[model samples]
Target: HWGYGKHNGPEHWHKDFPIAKGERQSPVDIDTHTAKYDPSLKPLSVSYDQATSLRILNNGHAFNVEFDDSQDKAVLKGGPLDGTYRLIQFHFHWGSLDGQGSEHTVDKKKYAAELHLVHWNTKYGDFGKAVQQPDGLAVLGIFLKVGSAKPGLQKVVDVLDSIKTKGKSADFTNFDPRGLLPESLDYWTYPGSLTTPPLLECVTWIVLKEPISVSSEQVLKFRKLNFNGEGEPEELMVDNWRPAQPLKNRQIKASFK
Candidate 1:
């Protein structure tokens, strides 16, 4: 499922995971030239919450993060968007090496890495049921740029050794979700389907305008994750990203005026 070789590298994930069929994905290169001014489509609001515990795991594919979603002390319900969505899961996308990090592009441009903060509608009882509705989910995507120097993602990187192998994951006893957000809250919102399989087309995507920072080493570390199960080389996940899809006349909205 997650190997980092040439033929079956991160770039080739869509080939194996047929569920990756043509979906409106993330990590699009943000070019200011074509940026349009839309006032009606803006974030209604943003809420914050602190997590009691957080852990980063290499689920044989991407870096799977488990957090405390039990409460909504720091929940956000942006306007222009309807319903309240709760955080369920968070994950990352990277390249086989440091250069290629994630799937999804803007005007057809890729990025180094992308972080997805996933949420489901509360009106549908829970995430499982919400995912099936038209307004079931909202994904906040934040881009990560790794350079020669390391950023402050040690909390995540520190646990890499624990889940170095397949099915391997360690515990992060007291982690907070807010620590991962970028300094700027500016974002782009749009209606689209899931980037991965099942291609659920009911999500309101809120992709951040400002990207977070990561280290070149951290990007390289992500490339080491395996996708295959039973710890086989074929299942390793050096790059677990999907390919970018077409806008296909889809309306991509932003928080800025």
Candidate 2:
């Protein structure tokens, strides 16, 4: 099993998962000056039914808030997507320390944390099949800066005490993922892969330009989570982020000027 430990970290992932070196891998550095602004880009259309949220789970990587995406109850359209993508889940990647954990960077500057709202192309029938296709996923990247306490995040943080151990889960409902988003829909779009293993190159990254604020105290709660399961030597689930990959020949586009 690969982890963010010193021995099995990101650098050693390629040994077991050969696709770790894939050209279109994720967590890329978004060079703001080089990204092209496209006037034709449509404003992102997000339709999320508040009741669709089912449960939240600790997957050893991050705490995922899974939604009932069986139907078109919650979907994301426009902004670089050719078709609709269903909101399956959302999670975060953070560091053990205050200023360090986002996977993607803006002009090489890293934020305190990053939130990923993962969706799969509904046109592909199902997420299992969609994951293998090139245009299968749309991940909305929201950067989290260290500032005031985010009231929207309190519900999620409160549940962390129960799921602090790996493989733990609890029922969570009535929460809308959109509450975590910033005011602006302006984003930088590019083609990339999942930041995690299996590393499928099927994601269209929509990184928001504006960042949401989170207090330092709240971030500390995230660090208290253990990557290791109950009874094991407590290994904190912090700094669980991949480094920026090469841009290759990919062109990043912007929705606003």
Candidate 3:
């Protein structure tokens, strides 16, 4: 029921979801000066199978690519994780225009958008139970910049037209999610929560330093998606990003010096 519109946006979310004001909230500002470089942190290990990718859908909030997490076919290890985290889904958050829609910021610099790869700790049983614990979720964030066209993103963009309306979905398979990552695995890690409600504080945020590239034309396709489904007045699904929250007392750990 909550969205990025004026009537029921982030500002009014705390009225319903009390956890929106929690100390470990996500999409925080990654201050380079304050972040400590930890030598003990291991390089991230990610294994993704192209065959595990399931369907792509427009869930009114954002477009998502679901994955088959029945087994450890695709999983993430190392880098602050205590155990294996199964790939569940991936999605993006952007704005109506370029240069301003990313949820996370570095030194107050906002990118065109951000990509989130959601994973759940297999040790916690299921995704539902995992989300209730402190180390249940691990989200890998890749910033998106407006620049040269990215051929790797062409397959994803091609499906936006089919799922332009809310509640619409299509068969999406045989796609490798790893091709979307940047060259550098350098990242900053901290404890945080889901950007949307019920804003659970169970995430270990791993934000990549280098951003991926996307064209201005490709960004326009994301704006074409509507939050309202058929029979309802169409609402442009732009600015589906949450503002950066306070860092509180959390210490941000960096993989690189």
Please name the candidate that would achieve the greatest lDDT relative to the true structure: 3
Root-mean-square deviation (CA) per prediction: 3.4, 0.9, 0.9
Model 3 spans > 4 angstroms off: none
**Model 3 per-residue lDDT at 100:** 90
- Cα lDDT listed for each candidate: 0.66, 0.91, 0.92
Q: Candidate 1, residues 26-94: lDDT per residue as tens digits?
A: 334444456564676645455654544566666665777776666764455764467677776688877
- Counted clashes in each candidate structure: 23, 0, 0
The TM-score values for the models, in the order shown, are 0.82, 0.98, 0.98
- Lowest summed-lDDT stretch of 10 residues in model 2? 45-54
Which regions of candidate 1 deviate over 4 angstroms? 1-35, 148-152, 234-236
lDDT of each residue in 195-256, candidate 3, tens digit only: 98889999999999999999999999999999999789989999999999988889999999
> Using alpha carbons, what is the TM-score of model 3?
0.98
Whole-model lDDT, candidate 2? 0.91
